[model samples]
Target chain A: SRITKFFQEQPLEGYTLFSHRSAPNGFKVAIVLSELGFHYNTIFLDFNLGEHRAPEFVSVNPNARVPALIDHGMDNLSIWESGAILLHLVNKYYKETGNPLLWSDDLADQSQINAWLFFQTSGHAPMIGQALHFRYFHSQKIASAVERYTDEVRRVYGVVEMALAERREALVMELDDYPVWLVGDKLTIADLAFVPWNNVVDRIGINIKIEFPEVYKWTKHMMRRPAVIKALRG
Target chain B: VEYSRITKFFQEQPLEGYTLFSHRSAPNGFKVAIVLSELGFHYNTIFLDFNLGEHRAPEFVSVNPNARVPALIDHGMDNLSIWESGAILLHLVNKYYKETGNPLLWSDDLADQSQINAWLFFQTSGHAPMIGQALHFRYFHSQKIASAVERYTDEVRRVYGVVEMALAERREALVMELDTSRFFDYPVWLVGDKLTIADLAFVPWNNVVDRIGINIKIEFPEVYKWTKHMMRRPAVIKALRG
Candidate 1:
């Protein structure tokens, strides 16, 4: 059964990916592995099995969270945090394949791409979490808490939408006139990065598209890709 | 010994192998979570329930005098613990991840590196403070005291403008490569097409932009696009949720 599970999620010829039984975080790694061509396998980390809270998993990832990767290739080259693993894999394979999944055509585009990705992880996602806590977790459901985050998320979505509208091609904006979003006029890692949260847009329930059409169109294009579809499933 | 005295004693202890403690449920804890997540190291998370005053307990005080959520215990039993979120991130990077395979601070040359350093310092001090002010204005203060949100956001906008200019002026894309053409040549974050630490350092702040609605993309389209791309990194996304 273990081997069967591995084969079902094969390609990681040696190592295993330990994901939480129920969490979007695990899904994040799942999506990347699917996109990376199943070059890996899965190890179901049963947090409910009292596995994650144990010292062993904690040793592998100090934070004691799931969706972590262990590389059986280099004596199990342990890499925690889904972001770093995705980055490593993208650089390792996508760069070699000369694909546009993770990187940019040039330096300018590359820097710009990182800027957006950081915004989501560091900026947009965290605030939304805080807002959610007040709205869902807290017993009182404080109006002030919900309002604070709702307003913030709305503002950020606006900024993202507006930027997509005026992006120019040639770094004339002082970035090689190359807009960071143009993955050769196709999808790239930047779009992939936003997918996790985009799915939750309905739950956070902000009408970004109605407010900003450019952002709506850009997001629609990103989700339409086969890789994105495959990536989100896991 | 008094708790403060004991904590001070450990505070002066040398850091060799250290593990930081933090609770993600807390707001400030994200600082440690994001950094440790990026460094890709195994660590111990000691939950500090402020309601229980556990963070202020004598044992915690012995480790971090202030009883901070994000404090580090030495690598071995003999190693001293270090506190402060930035210090933890900096120290971990100093110990394990020395190579600039992906670092936040970098330079094309000494000049570019210096350029990157200036921004790094600014983010910790200048940018963070303004963001704090904006936070107080928007969240805590109910923005009732002053239009401080506007003031803080404007200053933040100006700082972001400098980042825009740096990318603009560079002939190369992101300062990723080692440049032989000029005196200082090192492409750290966006120098080539490789991801750098600089990107990681700044991602958290960009999240702030969304809260503030400063219109980073509209005013600085290039910066917006770049920030969007960094989101795709599996590590970054995981860090966000974890």
Candidate 2:
């Protein structure tokens, strides 16, 4: 049963993920878990009930955020920060599969991938999230706050667009015509890391296809991956 | 060599250490500076004037596609230019410090490394950017929107409390796990038994509470103590000096 759960589609109890249904950070980790075919038990905390902020969840992630995991199989090693969790999973997945899925074995390529990961965590995720809050969630609507972060969202997308375009141009021979991925010819955590956030921007008036065509193609390519479909659909 | 043309020398010959492009006001750069200093490397800082848009210059953009301060040139690794404070920190300790049986800022164990990265990512992704917004609203913002200011400053305090709890928990753990009398003298860090880069990463922002109208020494004593402890280190002292 464990073997089937591990190798097949059925979710297993080896790993426990603490998450909220709507939190992007939670979905980010789930996407990777879904990709690796690792069966993890999800414990969805209701934010309105102050569950995430409770003492129990804080023990898992002192930051008191969703997407923290406990790899019970590995001495119950608990991890937080979606980026860190992604890296841990990638490392573990690579160790088992003998192929570096969602990552590269090349040190330079990995380094570039790390750069984008840090960018996602530091720049894109927080900045864009702030815009959404200032727009709809804030007690008082602050136009400047809205403007600053929305503008930042655009700037971040522009950077990604240029980087994706550059990677396409550089890898013309190896990659197909739509080389709409970050870091290398193939998909990486670098691209997948942004998927959750990319969908939320449309609520803030960002049309990816119209504004950033390259990123649009990239997102379309990302959606075609069966793993992404399962991750999102589930 | 003049700092402006130092980009040319990125590949001319192998240098003793790294070249750090930084700005005075940005706390992210200082985090890297402290690590470089602690590593005992011969790193040099090429101060960029943000007022003059030096960080956005074409040459620096080549170094960091995002055109942010704290981009780096690693002479040791085919002159690879790394960007993002977290990425630069990880690359340095990972590349140079992996071999030593006891790396100063990194751990030899995978679990500890995972925890180390968790905190590092927390500092960069969660801590730094939020505090930047707090600073923006409190001081730099065009209009003094009280509600906006309240949201972020409150966030800063909450973050400070998280650090306080972490340090308090670690201190208590150390005291219990070891002899209380002897462990009292032990300096508690973010992860593991020793001071790692993760501990150093938060010092820059923790130092800013006083300017933001929160009294850290009174409100968050453990944080105040932890930051004061790190700030007093020779490496941090050197980082602050430059």
lDDT of 1 by residue, B100-175 (tens): 5444423233223322323343454345556765767776764363434565677778767756654544525433
DockQ of each: 0.01, 0.69
Best by TM-score: 2
lDDT of 2 at B145: 86
For model 1, report DockQ.
0.01
lDDT digits (tens) for residues A1-234 of candidate 1 = 232343344343455777865455566666666676745666667656667666556545544556667655444555655554554555555545887565555533443344444445445665666566656765554576567777777776765664565453233556432223533344455566666666665566676667767667777766676766865664
Candidate 2: lDDT of B194?
83
Docking class of 2: medium
Return the lDDT, model 2, position B122. 90
In model 2, where do residues sit more than 4 Å from their true spots?
A1-13, A173-176, B1-16, B99-101, B178-185
Which residue runs of candidate 1 sit more than 4 Å off their true CA positions? A1-15, A44-50, A98-100, A168-186, B1-139, B143-242
Alpha carbon lDDT of residue B197, candidate 1?
Answer: 47
